[PDB]
Amino acid sequence: HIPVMVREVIEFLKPEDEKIILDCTVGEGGHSRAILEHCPGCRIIGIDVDSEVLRIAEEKLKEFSDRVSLFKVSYREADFLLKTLGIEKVDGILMDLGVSTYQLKGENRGFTFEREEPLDMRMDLESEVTAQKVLNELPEEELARIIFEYGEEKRFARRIARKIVENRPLNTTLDLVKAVREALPSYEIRRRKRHFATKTFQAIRIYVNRELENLKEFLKKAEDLLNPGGRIVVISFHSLEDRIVKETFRNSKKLRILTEKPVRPSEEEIRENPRARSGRLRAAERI
Numbered sequence: 546h547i548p549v550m551v552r553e554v555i556e557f558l559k560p561e562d563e564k565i566i567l568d569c570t571v572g573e574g575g576h577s578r579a580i581l582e583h584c585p586g587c588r589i590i591g592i593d594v595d596s597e598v599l600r601i602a603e604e605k606l607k608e609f610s611d612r613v614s615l616f617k618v619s620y621r622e623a624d625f626l627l628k629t630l631g632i633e634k635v636d637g638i639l640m641d642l643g644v645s646t647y648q649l650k651g652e653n654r655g656f657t658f659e660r661e662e663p664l665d666m667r668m669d670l671e672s673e674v675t676a677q678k679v680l681n682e683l684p685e686e687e688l689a690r691i692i693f694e695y696g697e698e699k700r701f702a703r704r705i706a707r708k709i710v711e712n713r714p715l716n717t718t719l720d721l722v723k724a725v726r727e728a729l730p731s732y733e734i735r736r737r738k739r740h741f742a743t744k745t746f747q748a749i750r751i752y753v754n755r756e757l758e759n760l761k762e763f764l765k766k767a768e769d770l771l772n773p774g775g776r777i778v779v780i781s782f783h784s785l786e787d788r789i790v791k792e793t794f795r796n797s798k799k800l801r802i803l804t805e806k807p808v809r810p811s812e813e814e815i816r817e818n819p820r821a822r823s824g825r826l827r828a829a830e831r832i
């Protein structure tokens with residue numbers, strides 16, 4: 546995986562001198578490595594809920610092991626993790642939402658619709674709920690709500706939910722693709738820019754990982770973890786996600802928005818990492 550919009554992350558996070566940075570979604574360690582290379586005196590507390598990517602990050606960040614520490618914990622519990630480390634506040638907070646390319650291409654958890662894999666989609670394999678259980682057992686009306694809300698399928702959510710039910714029991718990513726294909730007319734599939742199953746897969750993933758609920762709850766209080774002048778930078782890839790960030794930054798009384806308009810990748814930043822496409826970066830400062 547290649548770090549998305551690393552230049553803008555560094556620009557807004559302002560890692561310098563001996564700042565302490567909380568990387569809420571360390572993943573394979575891409576952004577963290579860039580920060581450590583850019584700032585020799587900084588310290589990073591990196592967290593993720595996926596132990597498999599933390600293994601990757603620990604090896605990738607080897608050369609900086611004395612200045613970065615990794616932990617398996619949800620950012621919703623970052624406040625107490627910091628306390629157990631003797632840290633009350635940090636100078637920077639970074640969040641890169643979504644899925645790591647390794648999670649997409651190498652974990653065999655069915656995050657992707659491109660190859661046949663089990664319907665798992667858990668970022669934390671220790672959690673109980675799987676995409677398979679959700680798809681095979683949730684009431685049809687709830688599936689419709691999820692696809693409409695998290696998938697943003699504003700016209701076909703009910704029909705996609707109906708096809709999922711008609712295709713039960715589902716077992717692989719290809720079974721889900723089949724359900725979505727049967728729900729969308731040929732002209733609609735062709736009309737779309739991204740693969741037609743993209744939104745439905747996203748909706749199930751977000752539900753399984755409580756991605757929007759976690760983000761909303763964390764961002765409400767994130768400001769309390771920042772030292773004066775501290776920076777919080779978030780990269781979203783979902784309109785509903787970006788809206789939550791935008792709104793949270795706006796409604797905060799302790800944060801001064803630094804990006805009225807979302808910072809987007811340059812056509813070139815897109816090449817250096819096609820994952821950057823759909824990426825919207827927002828930043829704010831503790832005042």
Ligand SMILES: C[S@@+](CC[C@H](N)C(=O)[O-])C[C@H]1O[C@@H](n2cnc3c(N)ncnc32)[C@H](O)[C@@H]1O
Pocket residue numbers: 546547548549569570571572573574575576577592593594595598618619620621641642643644645668754759
């Ligand atoms: C797009 S990836 C991060 C990529 C990373 N910035 C890089 O440069 O390698 C998003 C990450 O957030 C993690 N994640 C998801 N929910 C989380 C949560 N509640 N707390 C912490 N990490 C979480 C995922 O497991 C995934 O590793």
